[PDB]
Amino acid sequence: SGFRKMAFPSGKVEGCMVQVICGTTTLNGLWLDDVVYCPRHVICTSEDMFNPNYEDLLIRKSNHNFLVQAGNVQLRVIGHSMQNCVLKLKVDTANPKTPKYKFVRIQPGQTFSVLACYNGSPSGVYQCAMRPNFTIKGSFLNGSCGSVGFNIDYDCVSFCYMHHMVLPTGVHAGTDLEGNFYGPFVDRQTAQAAGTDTTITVNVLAWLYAAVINGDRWFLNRFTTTLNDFNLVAMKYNYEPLTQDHVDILGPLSAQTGIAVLDMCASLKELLQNGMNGRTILGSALLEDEFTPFDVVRQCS
């Protein structure tokens, strides 16, 4: 009954959020075991934002130049090290609330939950998708950096995103938990175009499937199409080209709903070529593509 954007319970990740101060810069860090991960641009003072030599800047910082607080507790930093665009502060105490976790680099088009924090304390949680251009359409203010994106499976938390900066278009760029930026972005104060924002076609089809599951069926047609046929009438609308894997990924949904995959593409083709006509699908007046096929199966169990 019903369907909306649902983030994972943020409890397993709150117990890992801490405050990190390095000069005038304050932001958030992730405390797992006896290490604290944070964006390396903490060490950057104001006049080091255009082109900062992080090696040179880090050579001037010592362990005591990094103050970490897990609430009122102050963790002693006993060893720092820069890994890609991320810093690894080794604290003397291990987080007793460290959950079963693993660092993973999500693929473009996969969803994850974000826990926007400020000054170490969590502020809110919301679902995000790794756009095809490698940006995320998040909600971040100053001090938001260090906030992580994650997926929760069973008892294992898969961290996949740490916020770093915003782009000139309002969307955001970040890094995986190993320090490598998603996309071609770099942690320098310079204008960085994000690239054309494509639409995750597989997710859209996945979203139409929960529609039919929930009783929204006005978009279903007596039509069908071919895979190549659909991609030609979908590239005009900047849609990710549908592959055979995408078809297979939608297999479980197609098999459950009794609606063939290519029949959905035919229903999607008519939506791109004719619009919504003021109708609505799962409460939305546009085509949603931040619901991955796997997100649908779990919410529509």
Added chain:
Amino acid sequence: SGFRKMAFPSGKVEGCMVQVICGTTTLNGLWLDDVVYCPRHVICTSEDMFNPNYEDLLIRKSNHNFLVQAGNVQLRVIGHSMQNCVLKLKVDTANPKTPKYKFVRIQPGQTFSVLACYNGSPSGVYQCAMRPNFTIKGSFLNGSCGSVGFNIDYDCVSFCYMHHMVLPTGVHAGTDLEGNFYGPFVDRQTAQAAGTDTTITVNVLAWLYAAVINGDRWFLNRFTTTLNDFNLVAMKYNYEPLTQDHVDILGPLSAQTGIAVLDMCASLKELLQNGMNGRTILGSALLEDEFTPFDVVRQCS
């Protein structure tokens, strides 16, 4: 930077979710101090769903007929009591993770976060609004009952909703934490019309304000209107009539944005009378009314 539906961190509420079994019925309960709150329709067997005499049904249940589990821990039920449509099982142990909390009955149009659970374990979290007709547009399946809605302020958790049933239209009805249903709904298996779904006009205006804050300004006009004038050209579209309080509530936003409240109404009037014209506002193709003015100020700090 950016703006989307953001729920409160669900950590303070996960430590209070437990499993409740009474016969073939299994659902979720809220464990605060030495009491567990759950919907009274646990005691209802299948053939007691049309018109159940809860007094009669509860007279046949004993303390041992209620099994409560907080994960692998089994809490002993030492005293049960029905309060309105909610049961209060007194367990022998107090929840060590009980947060500072209070039970509150939210007003129609206020938002709250929901933590949909199943078999006692949390599944996800999402933002909801108490619709004017007293329903909520949630996402619930079988076994979802007992899931709570809450707002988090500082360290205090204000529980305001416990899910009970779905309506014939896909929307959901529930109770406050004192057992009283929101709206005229009752916990019986019978068709219950929800009433016309009005639009929280104050929230819509609030949502347009974050728009202008975030750089979406195409909807702003050289026009203005009068309070009575706007309400007449808004009742046709089933919009909550704007009051002077609503105006005052939007004062902080209006004063910050340099846009008078009635000027926003004029911009809203043209949107209702002319549509979106394919444009978009904060990523939405329709007018959003589940962002309360207070939700905007905290997300746009």
